[PDB]
Design a binder for this molecule. Structure first.
Ligand SMILES: CN(C)CCC(=O)Nc1cccc(-c2c(-c3ccccc3)oc3ncnc(N[C@H](CO)c4ccccc4)c23)c1
Ligand SMILES: CN(C)CCC(=O)Nc1cccc(-c2c(-c3ccccc3)oc3ncnc(N[C@H](CO)c4ccccc4)c23)c1
Lengths: 303, 303
């Protein structure tokens, strides 16, 4: 008695798409920028193509395929979806290219041009995607600014479901085992007990919001991961960003409550941030949105 | 019986202004970027500061002072004016900073972002300044894109009156002697007979317009200056720029008539270009104002 997953998994021919440039290469193999040209059509779809480091690791090949299953099962405007897989020596994942890269880097290299409208609209969009994932019974487990991609400056999508997990109808949490999840974005209960829920994802959403409001600051900049558990237990949290009114900062702090159920639901976060987005300057003070006695010569008239 | 020139020549103290960066250094000494802070006021005026190469040439020091006299005698929104001179070892000229540099370089390093509206509005503004100079009885003798400066992208001013000459009420032309005037911008009669009139300046205006429409192309790119006189005599002129309709190109060609009096007057050029500026796309075809089967993945829906 569980809803059959009738997602279609498209198998693409390597000849159909053309890699163009490497976009980056972390501990997750390499991601390529490319063009997908389905033979029959008269279309050319810009795509990102992801594959693991050339060799075959048994456990890592299972995991890509697990990530394919989740990306192939999600359909929503604020969530990156799988277009298909290409079955070469190593398996390749293909998705829509998000040309402007990840949001974390974007805010960093656009501080001086990011209005409060964009910031709050991003917050709404991330909450919508997350809320969609909650509907889909999916616990992301790796929400951060670095895992949100930018299609256009006004349109961002959640991505990177390498750690995601599907919950049963008769199931409310996920108990991890292996670990190695980014400590500075995880809820306390997850650090202490390896428990992950949708409310755990809300914690991470909180930190993600903090990242954006601080234009890409690293959470707990000096602090080594070993200490994190202690300081949270004590009742320490991320500071209030300079641009943040108490109204917005209070939303952040609510995400970081010890009682997970007291934290806001994503559906609520959409409402709250939506409301704020209609009057962005009441909620984020940003100077733009070295001299002030400067006057132009054809205003300084000859005395 | 000639109108007394009651222009005021302001003498500035070197202590009042602060050089900040060199802007450039040609055969004309160096031009500095600076801030002028008149002691009594609470103002800070951005300025360009021009001085000859450190040494004193007798003939060249006379000429700076001649250029000071003309800049100090002009007052108009489309013409750069002298703010003052500073009497140091070598004499310094001071004017309003035109931060965006000269127009020639501007069009070159903004081709891909310059609309037809900007182009035609520049043409109007240059004609207005030139027409003002004609009123002031002043023959510029060195109009080119490189001698028009940019205050803002929408506001340009004529400058560089090192070759300018003042005409008498009972006087219609200027007969040069020394020469070394840029050959590729001068009217034929000037090349042949060293005659310079306001209508000679219209020729130069023509070439200046050609420069802008070709986004900074060098006139007669292959041709050495010695040949120029011949080819013009034969009836050869600059080609029609790609973006130029026959309407606009015809204005250019009219500036290059052999009979100087047949050429348009600046007052007429203001009208004509003004008219065109109200419907810029009827007069300049620019593609913006490598694939066209490209479609975004969240429009290519799974077939
Ligand atoms: C894995 N995670 C913990 C690190 C986040 C990360 O590095 N993401 C990443 C890395 C490299 C490229 C991209 C990416 C880009 C891109 C574009 C321009 C500049 C920089 C990056 O554009 C993208 N469009 C879609 N997906 C992207 N990356 C994801 C992997 O995070 C992806 C690609 C292909 C198939 C599945 C997922 C991308 C995204
Ligand atoms: C002399 N002529 C034949 C060459 C044209 C030329 O090189 N003009 C020039 C050279 C160097 C600086 C400037 C200039 C700039 C500027 C600003 C940013 C980048 C590049 C250039 O800004 C200016 N503002 C006002 N005047 C300028 N130059 C003129 C001389 O052409 C000038 C400066 C000071 C006093 C009188 C005139 C300028 C202008």
């Amino acid at each position: 008695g569980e809803a059959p997953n009738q997602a279609l998994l498209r198998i693409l021919k390597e000849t159909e798409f053309k890699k163009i440039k490497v976009l980056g290469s972390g501990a997750f193999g390499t991601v390529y920028k490319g063009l997908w040209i389905p033979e029959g059509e008269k279309v050319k779809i810009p795509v990102a193509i992801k594959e693991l480091r050339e060799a075959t690791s048994p456990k890592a090949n299972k995991e890509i395929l697990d990530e394919a299953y989740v990306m192939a099962s999600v359909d929503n405007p604020h969530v990156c979806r799988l277009l298909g897989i290409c079955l070469t020596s190593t398996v390749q994942l293909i998705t829509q290219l998000m040309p402007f890269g990840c949001l974390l880097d974007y805010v960093r290299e656009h501080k001086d041009n990011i209005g409060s409208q964009y910031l709050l609209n991003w917050c709404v969009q991330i909450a919508k995607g997350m809320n969609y994932l909650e509907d889909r019974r999916l616990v992301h487990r790796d929400l951060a600014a670095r895992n949100v991609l930018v299609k256009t400056p006004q349109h961002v999508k959640i991505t990177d479901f390498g750690l995601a997990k599907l919950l049963g109808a008769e199931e409310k949490e996920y108990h991890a085992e292996g670990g190695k999840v980014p400590i500075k974005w995880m809820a306390l209960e997850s650090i202490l007990h390896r428990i992950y829920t949708h409310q755990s994802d809300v914690w991470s959403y909180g930190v993600t919001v903090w990242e954006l409001m601080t234009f890409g600051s690293k959470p707990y900049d000096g602090i080594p991961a070993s200490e994190i558990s202690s300081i949270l237990e004590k009742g320490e949290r991320l500071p209030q960003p300079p641009i943040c009114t108490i109204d917005v900062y209070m939303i952040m702090v609510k995400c970081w409550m010890i009682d997970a159920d007291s934290r806001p639901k994503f559906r609520e976060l959409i409402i709250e941030f939506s409301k704020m987005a209609r009057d962005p300057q009441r909620y984020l003070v940003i100077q733009g949105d070295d001299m002030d006695d400067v006057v132009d010569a054809d205003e300084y008239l000859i005395p």
